[PDB]
């Protein structure tokens, strides 16, 4: 086989490309657009739908509809059309003669996996693929073979403790709070200052604001005390229309929701406390590397000042007699892809695909008994 | 001159080395532990079983299980694996190049010894081997000729009284209470303190606790009474996780079971009383010599303060006229191996081997014919 495609099916973005390298050959938001206007002027082929960067650019007169909600696909038609876009208009390769690599969050419904693999078989006529949890891909990106991995994507945040060469399925825990919920909370709290953001285009604008302005509080009460005399923390940003805004404590109050999920009315421990609980749920001995290897992946885990806050929280919760260090590579966006490409390029993996020949009689149910 | 392997496959450790060495050069726990997790991780050549120090180090995700139960072999395949490890990965000597010297507890089942010699001849193709007794080798290592040898290892506790040369076979008393039972009792009595240890890894942890935080009180009732003013009795222990343990009367209560076997529900006399019973089983003349020659042995007898208590109890039991002397060499941990190495390098011994041709022509009953 010449090459092997790897398609990181992210909840908010899409990562794709060939094996071996690391640079993403195709990155674009996972969005399908539907126009919501008459369009009196007629000509040059007014298409019925827009995807990717084209939809992102033309969002002015479009309704942006995400196809994945909390790591679960719910718009299968839009999803297969996005996959068509990825394999034709972005990678410019024929899917009929290349193995694929798909990424799925842990604890996802089995129906999602079966229908994904059956669609990839039938609609695309692909030789084989694999469905691996993105935690092991993050671990490959880190290069090590041991340590709990905190993954915080756009829809779902999950932790997977993996000791040397073995994983603990009973200790795997996930949370339904992620970047999309953070964006929604930021959009809600911006209204306190009078700003209005309701349409999905305004949601994208708020997402960009969170992208390039927000940061994690090292000490929540201390920074509230500092913001009482709000003179330096205030920043500014320009909207696409042209009018300028100013964001004060809302800059760091919205990513604080990760550590206090009660802000958005969810009863659940923060990311730090969930990581601590997942580690303590593990066996009494394997906790060494689990304290000493906290691999953070995902786009949401790249706020300017999240690593130190997480380290402080875990140090405070855990016993003081042993060290806790946080691993956070600068290439944190694409660690899942890097791990996927490394796994695909491994020689030992060449016989662990789910080939079409075996599917010809096994059926879509083979995915659970082959990938797990 | 005629170097021979000396393998003392004790119930808790496998002490091995060449004949004539001052101390054994191969000591490691007798544990074979398979992984108990799915292990979705691929690569790194994850083995299917780990033996010895590797198993102890990886015990975080391993199902450790001893292949021997109270001196009797119950996991013959696991014991063959352990023997292969000892011969190749630890001593690095071909089995068919040097003879071996084994030990087994008195009154053991005959099939155990028969299968032991059968395996070591059929499988490893060793030239010759001998099956001695732990008490005899302890007498060798003590540099004496008479006296009753109290041997208490991980598996079983046994006394073999030996006069000048001659050993009385009708006065051998064997008691199954041993270090593993003491460890189990320690696990049970740590629950009442609050700390819970369940799995095999926690069993190794509590064995490590007893390794260095336990002793035998010279007096029991007074020690328990003065434990009420808990000042100089308890002292903390650092658990592998990081939280600290604090054991009080548990320090000396779990080794007390040796002298009071009723704690674990056994209608048997303690070691202090069974020694006197074994002495009284002998003839009326050799008892005076046996009183003044008490050879302590085994790894269980390394409790700081056991010799004094044993001497006091035996003095109380025995008539007050003659003196009771107890022998506690500082190196009595490896006394059986020292005696085996001493015996192996003796000129008269080469006629006492079981040559390969003799076994081939005689079947597996030659060990009963010759060894004992």
């Amino acid at each position: 086989e010449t090459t092997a495609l790897v398609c990181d099916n992210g909840s908010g973005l899409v990562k794709a490309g060939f094996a071996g390298d690391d640079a993403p050959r195709a990155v674009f938001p996972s969005i399908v657009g539907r126009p919501r206007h008459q369009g009196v002027m007629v000509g040059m082929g007014q298409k019925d739908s827009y995807v990717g960067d084209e939809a992102q650019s033309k969002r002015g007169i479009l309704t942006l509809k995400y196809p994945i909600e909390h790591g679960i696909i719910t718009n299968w038609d839009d999803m297969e059309k996005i996959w068509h876009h990825t394999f034709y208009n972005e990678l410019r390769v024929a899917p009929e003669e290349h193995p694929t690599l798909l990424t799925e969050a842990p604890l996802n419904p089995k129906a999602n996996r079966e229908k994904m693999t059956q669609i990839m078989f039938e609609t695309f006529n692909v030789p084989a693929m694999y469905v691996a949890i993105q935690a092991v891909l993050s671990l490959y990106a880190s290069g090590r073979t041991t340590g709990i991995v905190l993954d915080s994507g756009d829809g779902v945040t999950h932790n997977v403790p993996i000791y040397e060469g073995y994983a603990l399925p009973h200790a795997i825990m996930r949370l339904d709070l992620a970047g999309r919920d953070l964006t929604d909370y930021l959009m809600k709290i911006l209204t306190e200052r009078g700003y209005s953001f309701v349409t999905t285009a305004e949601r994208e604008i708020v997402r960009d604001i969170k992208e390039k302005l927000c940061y994690v509080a090292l000490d929540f009460e201390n920074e509230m005390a500092t913001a009482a005399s709000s003179s330096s923390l205030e920043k500014s940003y320009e909207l696409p229309d042209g009018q300028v805004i100013t964001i004060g404590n809302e800059r760091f109050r919205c990513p604080e929701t990760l550590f206090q999920p009660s802000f958005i009315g969810m009863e659940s421990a923060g990311i730090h406390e969930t990581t601590y609980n997942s580690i303590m749920k593990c066996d009494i001995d394997i906790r060494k590397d689990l304290y000493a290897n906290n691999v953070m992946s995902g786009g949401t885990t790249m706020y300017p000042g999240i690593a130190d806050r997480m380290q402080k929280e875990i140090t405070a919760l855990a016993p003081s007699t042993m060290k806790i260090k946080i691993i956070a590579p600068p290439e944190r966006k694409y660690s899942v892809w890097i791990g996927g490409s490394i796994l695909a390029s491994l020689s030992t993996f060449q016989q662990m695909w789910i080939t079409k020949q075996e599917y010809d009689e096994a059926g879509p149910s083979i995915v659970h008994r082959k990938c797990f | 001159e005629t170097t021979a392997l000396v393998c003392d496959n004790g119930s808790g450790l496998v002490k091995a080395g060449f004949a004539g060495d001052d101390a054994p050069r191969a000591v490691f726990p007798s544990i074979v532990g398979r992984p108990r997790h799915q292990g979705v991780m691929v690569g790194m050549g994850q083995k299917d079983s780990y033996v010895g120090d590797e198993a102890q180090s990886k015990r975080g995700i391993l199902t450790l299980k001893y292949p021997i139960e109270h001196g009797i072999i119950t996991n013959w395949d696991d014991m063959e694996k352990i023997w292969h490890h000892t011969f190749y990965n630890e001593l690095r000597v071909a089995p068919e190049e040097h003879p071996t010297l084994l030990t087994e507890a008195p009154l053991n089942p005959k099939a155990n010894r028969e299968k032991m010699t059968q395996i070591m001849f059929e499988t490893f193709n060793v030239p010759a081997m001998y099956v001695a007794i732990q008490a005899v080798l302890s007498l060798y290592a003590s540099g004496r000729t008479t006296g009753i040898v109290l041997d208490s290892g991980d598996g079983v506790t046994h006394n073999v009284p030996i006069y000048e040369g001659y050993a009385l076979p009708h006065a051998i008393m064997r008691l199954d209470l041993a270090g593993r039972d003491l460890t189990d009792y320690l696990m049970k009595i740590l629950t009442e303190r609050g700390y819970s240890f369940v799995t095999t890894a926690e069993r190794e942890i509590v064995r490590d606790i007893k390794e260095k935080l336990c002793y035998v009180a010279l007096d029991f009732e007074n020690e328990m009474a003065t434990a009420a003013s808990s000042s100089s009795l308890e002292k903390s222990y650092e658990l592998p996780d990081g939280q600290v343990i604090t054991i009080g009367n548990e320090r000396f209560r779990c080794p007390e079971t040796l002298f009071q076997p009723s704690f674990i529900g056994m209608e048997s006399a303690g070691i202090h009383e069974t020694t006197y019973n074994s002495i009284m089983k002998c003839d009326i003349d050799i008892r005076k010599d046996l009183y003044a020659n008490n050879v302590m042995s085994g790894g269980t007898t390394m409790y700081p303060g056991i010799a004094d208590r044993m001497q006091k109890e035996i003095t109380a039991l025995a008539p007050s006229t003659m003196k009771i002397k107890i022998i506690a060499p500082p190196e009595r941990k490896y006394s059986v191996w020292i005696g085996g190495s001493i015996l192996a390098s003796l000129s008269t011994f080469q006629q006492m081997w079981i040559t390969k041709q003799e076994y081939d022509e005689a079947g597996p009953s030659i060990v009963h014919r010759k060894c004992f």
């Binding site: 020689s347 030992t348 016989q351 | 050549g45 071909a94 499988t123």
Partner: protein
């Protein structure tokens, strides 16, 4: 003890270090030039002659083809020691996994037969030797699996695995 590879008489055969680049038939990927489909290749003759070579204890080498035969014999001994008591699909999985493992090569410290096998001359020679040995042992394992289950499916034939404990030349991978 006079049994030797029939391809030691080959002329103009390419070589790396002191190991011949003998032709091989396989469905795998590697540098070996495909051989005729109606002949008696190196792997087939090595498998056929292993059951008699593993009993000798004195071998005199005549050329690089003998080195290839010795390497094949060592791999066959290893596989027979590993394939014991398994299924068919599990057997192919385990043997492919062990064959693809990053093993020791002549010129390295871990090679037991470093005395007889010369180190590669150049890094390119080292890499071509790497791929040659990988392809060779992959195809050898495939052929051995094909031969040993010639009668049943769910269990290895005990006649062919009774040689597992036989330790050919007392030196092997």
């Amino acid at each position: 003890p006079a049994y030797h590879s029939s391809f030691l008489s080959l002329t103009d055969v390419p070589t790396t270090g002191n190991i011949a680049m003998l032709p091989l038939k396989t469905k795998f990927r590697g540098p070996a030039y495909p051989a005729d489909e109606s002949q008696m290749d190196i792997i087939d003759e090595c498998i056929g002659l292993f059951r008699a070579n593993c009993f000798f204890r004195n071998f005199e080498i005549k050329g690089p083809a003998d080195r290839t035969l010795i390497y094949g014999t060592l791999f066959i001994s290893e596989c027979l020691g590993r394939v014991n008591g398994l299924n068919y699909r599990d057997a192919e999985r385990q043997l492919n996994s062990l064959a693809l493992e990053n093993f020791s090569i002549p010129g390295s410290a871990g090679f037991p037969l470093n005395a007889l096998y010369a180190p590669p001359l150049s890094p390119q020679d080292a890499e071509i030797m790497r791929t040659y040995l990988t392809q060779f042992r992959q195809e050898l394992a495939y052929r051995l699996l094909s031969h040993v289950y010639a009668t049943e499916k769910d269990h290895p034939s005990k006649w062919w695995t009774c040689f597992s404990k036989r330790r050919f030349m007392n030196k092997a991978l």
